[PDB]
């Protein structure tokens, strides 16, 4: 054939891939964290938006820190060979480097490490997108 | 050839390092509202980094907090794109 260019990710696999949405709204009382009013609007918007991009969307609500880690581990052990990409959306309280399960915090590095090139071989060389709506500290931008 | 184990990740953060992030109890969060609108309008036209740049512009321009508490009133937000990608990403093909 003619000259070929390889500057764009291959996105014509049989499936676009998974879109995992973790929507944490209600937190255990002992944590002291408020209910995140409005987050269901976000979760519904994301579901429809990524549906129209042909992602296989899975919505999960109010997961503990243990449930977040097990979900990510299990998803990272699926066979993604027929999938072009992977997307994860996290909606929660947070701090720099941290997102909250309903009962306490999770290091973001623990979640993303499951998808490292050497730990999830069916996503090696494929784009892995993490979309994070959470605080990263307590500074305010005055503008 | 080996690949770095951190290659081919993209982190679309709602806010800059060290900062709060804003969520409206009626309309949803500033970042997710804007992200979905820009994906709806541009996913069949633009590369993903350029879509996220339009999200940055929309969050920075169209939102400002309203609060009875002076500490939290009249504040702004900029999201933060962190890319370890090695190629351009288009959601369409052919």
């Amino acid at each position: 054939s003619g000259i070929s260019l390889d500057n764009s990710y291959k996105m014509d696999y049989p499936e676009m891939g998974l879109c995992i949405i973790i929507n944490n709204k209600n937190f255990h009382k002992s944590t002291g964290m408020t209910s995140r009013s409005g987050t269901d609007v976000d979760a519904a918007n994301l579901r429809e938006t990524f549906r129209n991009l042909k992602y296989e969307v899975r919505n999960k609500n109010d997961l503990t820190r243990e449930e977040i880690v097990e979900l990510m581990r299990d998803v990272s052990k699926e066979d993604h060979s027929k999938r072009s990409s992977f997307v994860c959306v996290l909606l929660s309280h947070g701090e720099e480097g941290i997102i909250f399960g309903t009962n306490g915090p999770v290091d973001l590095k623990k979640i993303t490490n499951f998808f490292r090139g050497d730990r999830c071989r069916s996503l090696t060389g494929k784009p892995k997108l993490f979309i994070i709506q959470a605080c990263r500290g307590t500074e305010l931008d005055c503008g | 050839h080996k690949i770095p184990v951190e290659a081919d990740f993209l982190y679309a953060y709602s806010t800059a390092p060290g900062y709060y992030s804003w969520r409206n109890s009626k309309d949803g969060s500033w970042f997710i509202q804007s992200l979905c609108a820009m994906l709806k309008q541009y996913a069949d036209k633009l590369e993903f980094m350029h879509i996220l740049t339009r999200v940055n512009r929309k969050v920075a321009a169209e939102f400002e907090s309203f609060s009875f508490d002076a500490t939290f009133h009249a504040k702004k937000q900029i999201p933060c794109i962190v890319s370890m990608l090695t190629k351009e990403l288009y959601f369409y093909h052919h």
Binding site: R36, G38, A134, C135 | W22, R23, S65, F66
Partner: peptide, 4 residues
């Protein structure tokens, strides 16, 4: 408007 609330913070996360």
């Amino acid at each position: 408007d609330e913070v996360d």
